[PDB]
UniProtKB/Swiss-Prot annotation, chain A:
Site (Important for activity): 160
Region (Interaction with the PRC2/EED-EZH2 complex): 2-250
Modified residues (Phosphoserine): 45, 49, 160, 200
Name the UniProt record assigns to this protein: DNA (cytosine-5)-methyltransferase 1
Domain of life: Eukaryota
Length: 250, 73, 75
């Protein structure tokens, strides 16, 4: 059972091979220069700092290793500086239509420097983003071939969203209150997720604690902080023991 | 008064009472007051264009019930 | 001899430059540094769908008067 030297997945899987790029796709710098992605009336002063990477939407997206395999992003490859590239169709940052139309097709984008979750403002959707050396992108819909991979990751992402939004909001609440909140949160309209339960949290406890900590740390200017609220102390304790020990306490 | 809407990328809709009088920097303060989002991190967009802190609503032709898009830096 | 061109950034700024068609890409980036403060090594210039190589000239890429180049930064 031979594995890819880069992405570590099993090679004897025809489904793994990334297909063709989106039609007439271009490289990342050329893509980013397309007028359809400009939200500026350009003037001799500029609107943003040069220190600030442009940010766009990306739809019909696929992520692959340098040997051409469709690849998940949550298994630690990016963090190990394994190069994951992507393709898809970039769209204006405000655009909420995940269709290919109005997009700029890009190929061999990246590699991805880091990925992240954001959008903890109480809206329906979680936001997943990629950073490259040239731009940031907010994901829309996966390509048909990449959809199964991206789908596998959605449960842990929305448990995290629930938790972050609950903790930022409710600085003196209990584990019991969090479970109640989780149980009463309706999964997102666009997906087919099961209801969330306490065991949902327990199974993803380590990932959830990491997202809280990353949320706090990214706040250079703690606007809605969490840190060590009581509920969070309980979550940290849970995340530091095995799943069986978490469940024993339930 | 006048009523405008603001979409975040999550689909969250913020409703605001404003007047063609305010600056964009004011609109951001109203957004800050109600959502706790620092104006420094706010980019507002209408008709496909990023708006400038110094200019006023009236100047960008924003009719009643119109929707702005909020993107965070 | 000199020629005016434009450098459109991804920040909503358009830069304007006087260059000679014998100038290298490397020279243009140097001018961009002087005027905008951008280290040349973070600079990528694009014309007609192509990424421009430091050693060639504007003439090599048939860049003409009032051509627009695109500046993309890797930071
Ligand atoms: Zn691979």
């Amino acid at each position: 059972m031979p594995k890819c030297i880069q992405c570590g997945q099993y090679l004897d899987d025809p489904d793994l091979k990334y297909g063709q790029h989106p039609p007439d796709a271009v490289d990342e710098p050329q893509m980013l220069t397309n007028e359809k992605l400009s939200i500026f009336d350009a003037n001799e002063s500029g609107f943003e700092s040069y220190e600030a990477l442009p940010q766009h939407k990306l739809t019909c997206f696929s992520v692959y290793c340098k040997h051409g395999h469709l690849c998940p992003i949550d298994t630690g490859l990016i963090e190990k500086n394994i190069e994951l590239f992507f393709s898809g169709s970039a769209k204006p940052i405000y655009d909420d239509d995940p269709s290919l139309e109005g997009g700029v097709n890009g190929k061999n984008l990246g590699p991805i420097n880091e990925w992240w979750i954001t959008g903890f403002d109480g809206g329906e959707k979680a936001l997943i983003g990629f950073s490259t050396s040239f731009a940031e992108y907010i994901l829309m819909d996966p390509s048909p071939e990449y959809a199964p991979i991206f789908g596998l990751m959605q449960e842990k992402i929305y448990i995290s969203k629930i938790v972050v939004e609950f903790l930022q909001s409710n600085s003196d609440s209990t584990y019991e209150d969090l479970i109640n909140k989780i149980e009463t949160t309706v999964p997102p309209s666009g997906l087919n997720l099961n209801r969330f339960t306490e065991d949902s949290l327990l199974r993803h406890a380590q990932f959830v604690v990491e997202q809280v900590e990353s949320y706090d740390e990214a706040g250079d200017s703690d606007e809605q902080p969490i840190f060590l609220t009581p509920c969070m102390r309980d979550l940290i304790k849970l995340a530091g023991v095995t799943l069986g020990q978490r469940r024993a306490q339930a | 008064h006048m009523q405008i809407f603001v979409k975040t990328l999550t689909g969250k809709t913020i409703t605001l009472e404003v007047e063609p009088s305010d600056t964009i920097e004011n609109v951001k303060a109203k957004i800050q007051d109600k959502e706790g989002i620092p104006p420094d991190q706010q980019r507002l967009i209408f008709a496909g264009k990023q708006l400038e802190d110094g200019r006023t609503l009236s100047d960008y032709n924003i009719q009643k019930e119109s929707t702005l898009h909020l993107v965070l830096r």
